[PDB]
């Protein structure tokens, strides 16, 4: 039901934003963890 | 909710993109970036918490 | 040169609507997949607009004030828009511009012109060998001092042409800024009789010419001994624009496809 | 600079570093070598048909020449000693000997000498009033010189002759021919001349042996436009050859900038010349040799974290490049 | 912010340094102060969250 | 009423109307070939 966005993978506005100094870390608790 | 994306922003790649003399002349400012990525730093390991 | 020709019905003006047009690319700047928000004159949407046509009988060719710019259109067949004059006082005081878009050539003259009651073209009709040929340049009869003088390569277009609705859809824009006049246009096959087409369209930038004049009246020449005379059908639309913060809707492709007349 | 233990150090300023892990600075791929391409145009341009013209025309009637297609160089009239002054407003003569310009308009006339203050933009009086006026956004150069010896004659060559009434200001880029009277008192007048019936146009006292400031002086004006249009006049640089997929630096038709040049599917019409970002930054460009769009990327570059245990137990660090495959750290500020 | 354009490398081609440090600076001043008003906010939504 | 660790003294003689050339951070022919200043130059020019 959420749609997220901006992955930003290495190689839109993602990646736009990728060039300018704007960096999204990724979270330290994954998907599963958090599951389990 | 719980949380927000851990989000980071560099000064000298934003403001002053790839220049040297835009950076020789930032420095006269002082520290302010220091205090910016701080901030963010610190929400960044709020976020973990 | 000239005839004074009035062998026509008097008729009042009409009155139209400009329902979505009169936008044009604002600079040559490639943008893409995104909104972007300008200010230049514009013609406002819905906006009350002056038909003019000539058929059979009817031949109106009034000199007509020009102001912050003019948006054209004709809707036509057997080509019979040829030429536009441009100025401020018309009688060899002030230089004036005069486009031709004849048969053979795009002759382009920015000259100290001097005009007459009637400045206008015309061809003759039919005469046994297939061809409508020209007959009648009767526009002006003394030029003085000419800055800008231009004739393109010769060719030759067709004098020729029976429809009852009109498919030649000829779109332009014309401004003086900066001493440059500047011509947007635009050219569409189209099933429609006597109005305006009900739809939108980009302005391309085509020309510009570095003038420097001003500008304030202008008349146009359409193609027709002294009277007795064949007009084809054919209808004109006259507009004037206005500033005005526009929003425009860049594709993918880089095309401007939708705008807001804000 | 030595290792990334030092520069933990440095960017906390302290000896001492603690347990955990810090984000630095970061890395980016230097360019290796430098791209210019400029159009080939070959032609120069006709200077001394502006500068050594044998006469110049009135200031109420200041002649334009539109010079486009030639290759100038700026540097051989700016390092003559003649001129009286050089002042420039758009840009800084240093620069002129290698930036393109799209069409450039030359304005030459004559004038009395201490009104040349009054040529500047942005200044009102007589000349700027009446005669010439320049917008306040000037983007181009003034050049003006004595020429005393050449045009005043003891008789006075007295077909030199300015506005000095007139009905109210004018826009920039305004010139008016005009032999209408002018009506200083509040009364109409009509037919030619009467009481405070004046003649608009009225001539300097050009005699050899007047004092300075009332000396004539030719003025030429430079008045090109940016950087913003499919140009013609460029300054004398050759070009190079064309690399694609280096970090390079590449100086198209004076777009300045650091990156990687890539083939591109972007279909430009062909009247369009640039390509900009969200951000304003320049993208796409079409190569002024071969007509090609190319698409500009900036290097690689990413976040550089540091792990380290604590000073108290260790030495040894290690390094987290942030967001990025491992290939790009051999080649690796 | 009041410059004669946005693009640094524009201003860094076009003029010599001595008077390109009027123009830097007001970018700089621009630039710097619309980062801290974004920082402020994300420390605030940070708060609620 | 302030104090200076050296104080240096350049002489010379040019042509008169270029003397806005020798001030610090404008280009021309006396300050591109001849005499250059430096952008924070401080002292005094001195001409007559
Ligand atoms: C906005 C637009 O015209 N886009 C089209 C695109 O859909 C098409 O795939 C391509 C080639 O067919 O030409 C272009
Ligand atoms: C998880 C993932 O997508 N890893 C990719 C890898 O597949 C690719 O070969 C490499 C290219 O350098 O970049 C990284």
């Known amino acids: 039901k959420v749609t997220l966005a901006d992955a930003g993978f290495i190689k839109d506005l993602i990646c736009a934003q990728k060039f300018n100094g704007l960096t999204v870390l990724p979270p330290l608790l994954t998907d599963e963890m958090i599951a389990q | 909710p719980v949380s927000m994306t851990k989000t980071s922003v560099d000064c000298t790649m934003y403001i002053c993109g790839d220049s040297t003399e835009c950076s020789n002349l930032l420095l006269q400012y002082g520290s302010f970036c220091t205090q910016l990525n701080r901030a963010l730093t610190g929400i960044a390991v709020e976020q973990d918490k | 040169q000239c005839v004074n020709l009035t062998t026509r019905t008097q008729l009042p003006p009409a009155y139209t609507n400009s329902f979505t047009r009169g936008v044009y690319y604002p600079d040559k700047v490639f943008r893409s997949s995104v909104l972007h928000s300008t200010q230049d004159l514009f013609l406002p949407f819905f906006s009350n607009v002056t038909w003019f046509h000539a058929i059979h009988k009817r031949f109106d060719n009034p000199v007509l004030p020009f102001n912050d710019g003019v948006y054209f259109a004709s809707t036509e067949k057997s080509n019979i828009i040829r030429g536009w004059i441009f100025g401020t006082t018309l009688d060899s005081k002030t230089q004036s511009l005069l486009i031709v878009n004849n048969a053979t050539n795009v002759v382009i003259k920015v000259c100290e012109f001097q005009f007459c ?58 401004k003086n800024i900066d001493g440059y006049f500047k011509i947007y246009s635009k050219h569409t096959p189209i099933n429609l009789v006597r109005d305006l ?56 492709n880089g095309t401007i496809t939708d705008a807001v007349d804000c | 600079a030595l290792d990334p233990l030092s520069e933990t150090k440095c960017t906390l300023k302290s000896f001492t570093v603690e347990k955990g892990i810090y984000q630095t600075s970061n890395f980016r791929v230097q360019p290796t070598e430098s791209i210019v391409r400029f159009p080939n145009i070959t032609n120069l341009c006709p200077f001394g048909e502006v500068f050594n013209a044998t006469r110049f025309a009135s ?60 040529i500047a933009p942005g ?137 990687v040049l890539t083939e591109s599917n972007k279909k430009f019409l062909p009247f369009q010349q640039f390509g900009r970002d969200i951000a304003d930054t320049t993208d796409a460009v079409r190569d002024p040799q071969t007509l090609e769009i190319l698409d500009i ?24 490049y942030q967001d990025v495959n491992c290939t790009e750290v051999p080649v690796a500020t | 912010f009041g410059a004669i354009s946005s693009v640094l490398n524009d201003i860094l081609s076009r003029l010599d340094p001595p008077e390109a440090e009027v123009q830097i600076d007001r970018l700089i001043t621009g630039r710097l102060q619309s980062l801290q008003t974004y920082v402020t906010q994300q420390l605030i939504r940070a708060a609620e969250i």
């Open chain 4, 123 to 259: 200044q009102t009086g007589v000349i700027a009033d009446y005669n010439y006026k320049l917008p306040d956004d000037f983007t181009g150069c003034v050049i003006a010189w004595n020429s005393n010896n050449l045009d005043s004659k003891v008789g006075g060559n007295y077909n030199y002759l300015y506005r000095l009434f007139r009905k109210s200001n004018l826009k920039p880029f305004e010139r008016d021919i005009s032999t209408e009277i002018y009506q200083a008192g509040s009364t109409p007048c009509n037919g030619v001349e009467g009481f405070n019936c004046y003649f608009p146009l009225q001539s300097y006292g050009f005699q050899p042996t007047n004092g300075v400031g009332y000396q004539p002086y030719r003025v030429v004006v430079l008045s090109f436009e940016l950087l913003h249009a499919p140009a013609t006049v460029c300054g004398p640089k050759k070009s190079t050859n064309l690399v694609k997929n280096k970090c390079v630096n590449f100086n198209f038709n004076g777009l300045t900038g650091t990156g």
């Open chain 3, 117 to 174: 009651n009637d400045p206008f073209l015309g061809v003759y009709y039919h005469k046994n060998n297939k061809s409508w040929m020209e007959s009648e340049f009767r526009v002006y009869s003394s030029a003085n001092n000419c800055t800008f003088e231009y004739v393109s390569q010769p060719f030759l277009m067709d004098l020729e042409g029976k429809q009852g609705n009109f498919k030649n859809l000829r779109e332009f824009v014309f």
């Open chain 4, 297 to 320: 990327t900036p290097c690689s570059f990413g976040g550089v974290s540091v792990i380290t245990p604590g000073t108290n137990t260790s030495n040894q660090v290690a390094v987290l």
């Open chain 3, 197 to 252: 087409p009900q739809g939108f369209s980009a302005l391309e930038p085509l020309v510009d010419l570095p003038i420097g004049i001003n500008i304030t009246r202008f008349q146009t020449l359409l193609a027709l001994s002294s009277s007795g005379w064949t007009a084809g059908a054919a209808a004109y639309y006259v507009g004037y624009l206005q500033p005005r913060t526009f929003l425009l809707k860049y594709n993918e």
């Open chain 4, 59 to 118: 200031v109420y009637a200041w002649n334009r020449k539109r010079i486009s297609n030639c290759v100038a160089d700026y540097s051989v009239l700016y390092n003559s000693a003649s001129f009286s002054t050089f002042k420039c407003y758009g840009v800084s003569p240093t620069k002129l000997n290698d930036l393109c310009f799209t069409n450039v308009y030359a304005d030459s006339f004559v004038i009395r000498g201490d009104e040349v203050r009054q």
